[PDB]
């Protein structure tokens, strides 16, 4: 059971996004103690944002990523109090110019909690 989100009535959440261009996600040691990697991209969005929607915002910031065939691998980076540290969990991928089965995956469907980081490993075609 999910609540529909009215984006004029619900204020957006701050999403802190990190990207690579070599197909590999950031190491966990780059996030220790509140440090973060270079090139943070700050997005304001909603819990029903989809991978396809987020991909277009990323393409807005990096036009080279627009090229047909570009692969976006999405991972959530999140503090797990159970282990004393950050963990990364890959959630899905999209590709420029292709319709894939993760296009419509949403943050909340993945149990994303606000404040968790998004890490996007991008592979040129």
């Amino acid at each position: 059971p999910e609540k529909p989100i009215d984006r004029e009535k619900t204020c957006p959440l701050l999403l802190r996004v990190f990207t690579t261009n070599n197909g590999r996600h950031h190491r966990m040691d780059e996030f220790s103690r509140g440090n973060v990697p270079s090139s943070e991209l700050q997005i304001y969005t909603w819990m029903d944002a989809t991978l396809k929607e987020l991909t277009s915002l990323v393409k807005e910031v990096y036009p080279e990523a627009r090229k047909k065939g570009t692969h976006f691998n999405f991972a959530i980076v999140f503090m797990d109090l159970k282990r004393p540290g950050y963990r990364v969990k890959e959630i899905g991928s999209t590709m420029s110019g292709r319709k894939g089965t993760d296009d419509s995956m949403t943050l909340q469907s993945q149990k994303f909690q606000i404040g968790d980081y998004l890490d996007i490993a991008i592979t040129p075609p």
Binding site: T10, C11, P12, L13, L14, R16, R33, G34, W46, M47, M79, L81, P84, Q113, I114, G115, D116
Partner: protein, 88 residues
Amino acid sequence: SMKPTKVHIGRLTRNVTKDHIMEIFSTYGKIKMIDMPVERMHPHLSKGYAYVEFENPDEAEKALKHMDGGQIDGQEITATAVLAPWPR
């Protein structure tokens, strides 16, 4: 019989800082004290709540009026009056 001046703010996202809380709730009155505890084993992170004490009960009432059910960083928050001395 005297009315409370201290409020508990709940459901704060992991993005929300002590300064954000000062800035937002100062909208409703003069803040005399804030307590926003951090994760013991990860001090850079809050526990997701704060106490805010105002100078007078009218201000605390106002804050509760406007923000219990209000939103901070895209998430609905709780605001409730608290009658207790600071923790020991």
